[PDB]
Amino acid sequence: KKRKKKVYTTPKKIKHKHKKVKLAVLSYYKVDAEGKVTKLRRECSNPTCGAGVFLANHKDRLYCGKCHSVYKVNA
Amino acid sequence: GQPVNDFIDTATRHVLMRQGVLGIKVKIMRDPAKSRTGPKALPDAVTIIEPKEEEPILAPSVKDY
RNA sequence: ACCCACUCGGCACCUUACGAGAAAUCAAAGUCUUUGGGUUCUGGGGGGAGUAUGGUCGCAAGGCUGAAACUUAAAGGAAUUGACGGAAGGGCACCACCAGGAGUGGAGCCUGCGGCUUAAUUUGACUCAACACGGGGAAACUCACCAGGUCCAGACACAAUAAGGAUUGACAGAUUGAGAGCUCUUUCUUGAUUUUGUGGGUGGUGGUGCAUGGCCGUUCUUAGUUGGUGGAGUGAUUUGUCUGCUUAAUUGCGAUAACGAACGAGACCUUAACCUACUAAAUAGUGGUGCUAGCAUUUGCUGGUUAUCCACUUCUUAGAGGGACUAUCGGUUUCAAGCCGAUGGAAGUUUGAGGCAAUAACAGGUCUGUGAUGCCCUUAGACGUUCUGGGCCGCACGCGCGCUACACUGACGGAGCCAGCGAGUCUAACCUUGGCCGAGAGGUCUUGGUAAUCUUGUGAAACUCCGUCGUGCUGGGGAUAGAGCAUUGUAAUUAUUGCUCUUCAACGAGGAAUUCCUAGUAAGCGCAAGUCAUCAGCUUGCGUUGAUUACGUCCCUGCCCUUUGUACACAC
RNA sequence: UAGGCAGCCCCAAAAACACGUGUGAGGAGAAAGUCCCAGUCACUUUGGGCAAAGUAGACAGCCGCGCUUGCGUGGUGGGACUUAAUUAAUGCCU
Numbered sequence: 001k002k003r004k005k006k007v008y009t010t011p012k013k014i015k016h017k018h019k020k021v022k023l024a025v026l027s028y029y030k031v032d033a034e035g036k037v038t039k040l041r042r043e044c045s046n047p048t049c050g051a052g053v054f055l056a057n058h059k060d061r062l063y064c065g066k067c068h069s070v071y072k073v074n075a
Numbered sequence: 076g077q078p079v080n081d082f083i084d085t086a087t088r089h090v091l092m093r094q095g096v097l098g099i100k101v102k103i104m105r106d107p108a109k110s111r112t113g114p115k116a117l118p119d120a121v122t123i124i125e126p127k128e129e130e131p132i133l134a135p136s137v138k139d140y
Numbered sequence: 141a142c143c144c145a146c147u148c149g150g151c152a153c154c155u156u157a158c159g160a161g162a163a164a165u166c167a168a169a170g171u172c173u174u175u176g177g178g179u180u181c182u183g184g185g186g187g188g189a190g191u192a193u194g195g196u197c198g199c200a201a202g203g204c205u206g207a208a209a210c211u212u213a214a215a216g217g218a219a220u221u222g223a224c225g226g227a228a229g230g231g232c233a234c235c236a237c238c239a240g241g242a243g244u245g246g247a248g249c250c251u252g253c254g255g256c257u258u259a260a261u262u263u264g265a266c267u268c269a270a271c272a273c274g275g276g277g278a279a280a281c282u283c284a285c286c287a288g289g290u291c292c293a294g295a296c297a298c299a300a301u302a303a304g305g306a307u308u309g310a311c312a313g314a315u316u317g318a319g320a321g322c323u324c325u326u327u328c329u330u331g332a333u334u335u336u337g338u339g340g341g342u343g344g345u346g347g348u349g350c351a352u353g354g355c356c357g358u359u360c361u362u363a364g365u366u367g368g369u370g371g372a373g374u375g376a377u378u379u380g381u382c383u384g385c386u387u388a389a390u391u392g393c394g395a396u397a398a399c400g401a402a403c404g405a406g407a408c409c410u411u412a413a414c415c416u417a418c419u420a421a422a423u424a425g426u427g428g429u430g431c432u433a434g435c436a437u438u439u440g441c442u443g444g445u446u447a448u449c450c451a452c453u454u455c456u457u458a459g460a461g462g463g464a465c466u467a468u469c470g471g472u473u474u475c476a477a478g479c480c481g482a483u484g485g486a487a488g489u490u491u492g493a494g495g496c497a498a499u500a501a502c503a504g505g506u507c508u509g510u511g512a513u514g515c516c517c518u519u520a521g522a523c524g525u526u527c528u529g530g531g532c533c534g535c536a537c538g539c540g541c542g543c544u545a546c547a548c549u550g551a552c553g554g555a556g557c558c559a560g561c562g563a564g565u566c567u568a569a570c571c572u573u574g575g576c577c578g579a580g581a582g583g584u585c586u587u588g589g590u591a592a593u594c595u596u597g598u599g600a601a602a603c604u605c606c607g608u609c610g611u612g613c614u615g616g617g618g619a620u621a622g623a624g625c626a627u628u629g630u631a632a633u634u635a636u637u638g639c640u641c642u643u644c645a646a647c648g649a650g651g652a653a654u655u656c657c658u659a660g661u662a663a664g665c666g667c668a669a670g671u672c673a674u675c676a677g678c679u680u681g682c683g684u685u686g687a688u689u690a691c692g693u694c695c696c697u698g699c700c701c702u703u704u705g706u707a708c709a710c711a712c
Numbered sequence: 713u714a715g716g717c718a719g720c721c722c723c724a725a726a727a728a729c730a731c732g733u734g735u736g737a738g739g740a741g742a743a744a745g746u747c748c749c750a751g752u753c754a755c756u757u758u759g760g761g762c763a764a765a766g767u768a769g770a771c772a773g774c775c776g777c778g779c780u781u782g783c784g785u786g787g788u789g790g791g792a793c794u795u796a797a798u799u800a801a802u803g804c805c806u
């Protein structure tokens with residue numbers, strides 16, 4: 001046998017490209033005149049993630065992105 | 076016949092070339108009298124030993140110890 | 141008239157090769173490179189072409205004479221080997237026949253193939269030598285087909301991306317078969333571990349078996365194939381290697397310009413058949429019984445052991461061996477090879493059966509068994525892989541391998557009830573005893589067996605006996621379909637399969653035709669094993685019961701050889 | 713009744729012209745058997761081709777109908793003339 005041509009009935013799909021963003025410090029670190037910087041978002045509260053991961057905020061709830069944990073903004 | 080297993084080794088081999096694969100075969104029958112383990116000759120090699128012809132006697136010539 | 145011996149002339153003939161010839165052959169075709177007796181005619185590669193024209197002869201038909209342009213590297217002669225022949229002859233073979241046996245082809249179903257539909261019903265193979273074959277009884281996988289969804293499992297080098305961060309991976313909702321962040325809202329994180337481009341590689345049941353290897357099938361399981369010396373021929377080549385008889389056989393006996401040899405065959409190896417002769421044995425048994433008990437009773441049948449005994453290896457097993465060599469006799473035949481009959485022997489068909497199996501080949505099959513493969517294709521929206529679903533099984537039809545039946549040599553029920561070949565799990569759930577539940581399949585707790593130990597003594601069917609039926613498409617037959625009960629499996633839906641009930645289809649001995657088969661063989665019957673989680677109507681092996689027929693022939697088929705013919709040699 | 717176990721019952725004996733029961737000129741409905749047969753396409757026969765034979769096969773065509781221009785809806789096989797069909801072959805290329 002020889003293969004026939006393939007003409008899909010659905011259009012082509014594209015892959016995820018991670019958004020190259022020019023921020024790593026402004027999202028979590030608050031500007032101070034003296035220099036005492038507080039964090040604006042929580043870390044992995046699982047026992048075996050760590051305390052510097054600065055999880056993914058949303059409009060309604062909290063997801064980590066790394067430590068799999070799910071929490072609440074109204075805490 | 077079983078003499079092919081007793082006296083003959085056989086090899087086959089593929090050789091790669093730019094044109095294709097080549098099949099080489101080598102068949103070797105070594106001397107059966109050098110086998111020294113089991114069979115000594117071919118199964119149909121029937122050799123009769125010499126009669127050792129002796130000069131016949133005429134007188135009795137009894138001999139005593 | 142005949143016979144004999146001569147002779148001249150003639151038609152021929154037989155042997156030989158003096159001698160010739162390319163050879164076939166030739167007493168001329170000899171007396172020719174050692175070439176000269178006399179003389180006439182004819183040819184100069186093959187076609188064009190014995191054609192055109194001219195002449196001449198003829199009533200005509202045509203005869204005689206007779207070119208050129210052009211075209212071509214061969215045409216041709218004799219002989220050899222092979223192939224082929226709708227040529228002759230001789231052999232062989234239940235993949236041929238005779239005589240028979242069982243059948244298939246008829247009926248229903250299982251399965252393979254062709255055809256049709258489809259998005260797909262994947263493909264390979266089409267006489268023997270395709271059609272229960274790819275050891276292919278496919279629900280996932282097998283898969284290579286189709287339809288969808290991801291992943292790269294795209295090495296390595298260079299140039300960028302750029303660490304003000306190349307990029308992987310993401311819960312949740314939507315989308316999606318999907319509890320795939322596949323992608324959309326989102327910012328979390330891993331962090332030369334990536335991404336893009338080129339070169340280059342890799343995967344591919346993608347193609348090409350008419351590019352190939354290996355392997356297998358076939359010629360051919362037939363019996364054929366070679367060279368040494370010598371003989372023949374200028375040579376290719378031939379004899380040896382054969383008229384005949386014999387054999388399974390180029391097996392031998394013989395014949396004989398052949399003689400002596402090699403491969404094949406045979407020999408050989410494995411299995412089966414025998415051994416009261418050897419070695420033995422709680423993983424095999426046997427007898428008395430060290431021990432014991434049962435029942436019938438004055439001993440028969442047993443149940444339990446080897447420090448709950450001893451003896452032995454007949455039966456069982458595997459090591460070494462012996463035995464068959466066609467042995468003795470008779471007949472026949474070249475008194476040879478042999479063949480046949482009888483006797484004996486476990487064995488007298490190569491003792492039965494297989495394994496290996498010569499030279500030379502096929503555009504035989506397989507690239508889809510191979511990480512065997514050249515080339516080609518594809519290599520990312522993949523012809524790679526994976527996930528989901530379906531399919532290969534689709535049904536107006538045809539053919540083949542098969543199973544079940546058409547009945548009384550039977551169907552069903554009860555009773556007795558013997559094999560052999562094998563397979564087995566902790567290298568995880570294999571073969572299963574016992575106990576219990578369940579009509580049943582099946583389920584529960586265990587036990588023995590990693591194995592001559594347990595399944596297992598596989599307590600098999602067929603069968604033997606006793607009953608029911610009594611020639612009724614009937615209690616022969618079980619096609620098809622409905623309901624449920626359980627197993628294996630993620631998944632039983634197109635019903636995997638088993639089981640209980642119910643329907644009782646065609647089939648009333650089957651056309652042309654076609655297959656296999658000579659002894660523990662055909663055939664009947666069952667059993668174990670391949671595949672397998674399950675499923676065999678298939679296959680590889682095993683055992684039980686066990687015929688009839690013939691010891692032959694070339695009628696048909698196919699194969700081989702000899703002669704013969706050929707303008708064939710790629711070989712009809 | 714010849715026989716069989718045979719007195720029943722049971723299984724089993726005995727032909728030829730009617731030109732005849734196979735007609736007419738018979739008319740008609742429904743179908744079978746054949747020289748000659750069928751328009752294209754498929755396959756089946758072949759190692760493969762053709763030439764011939766075959767298949768309930770698709771499109772036809774034909775016979776008609778429907779409310780028609782466009783078309784659809786049904787059959788989609790029908791012909792003609794003989795005392796039991798005989799198949800002799802390979803019929804020709806590659």
Ligand SMILES: [Mg+2]
Binds near residue numbers: 150151
């Ligand atoms: Mg004369």
Ligand SMILES: [Mg+2]
Binds near residue numbers: 184
């Ligand atoms: Mg010349």
Ligand SMILES: [Mg+2]
Binds near residue numbers: 185
């Ligand atoms: Mg000339």
Ligand SMILES: [Mg+2]
């Ligand atoms: Mg035949």
Ligand SMILES: [Mg+2]
């Ligand atoms: Mg016969």
Ligand SMILES: [Mg+2]
Binds near residue numbers: 244
């Ligand atoms: Mg039959």
Ligand SMILES: [Mg+2]
């Ligand atoms: Mg049939």
Ligand SMILES: [Mg+2]
Binds near residue numbers: 283284
């Ligand atoms: Mg597939």
Ligand SMILES: [Mg+2]
Binds near residue numbers: 291
């Ligand atoms: Mg991906």
Ligand SMILES: [Mg+2]
């Ligand atoms: Mg010579």
Ligand SMILES: [Mg+2]
Binds near residue numbers: 381
């Ligand atoms: Mg010769």
Ligand SMILES: [Mg+2]
Binds near residue numbers: 076497
């Ligand atoms: Mg041999």
Ligand SMILES: [Mg+2]
């Ligand atoms: Mg199939």
Ligand SMILES: [Mg+2]
Binds near residue numbers: 597
């Ligand atoms: Mg047994």
Ligand SMILES: [Mg+2]
């Ligand atoms: Mg029945």
Ligand SMILES: [Mg+2]
Binds near residue numbers: 641
């Ligand atoms: Mg029922």
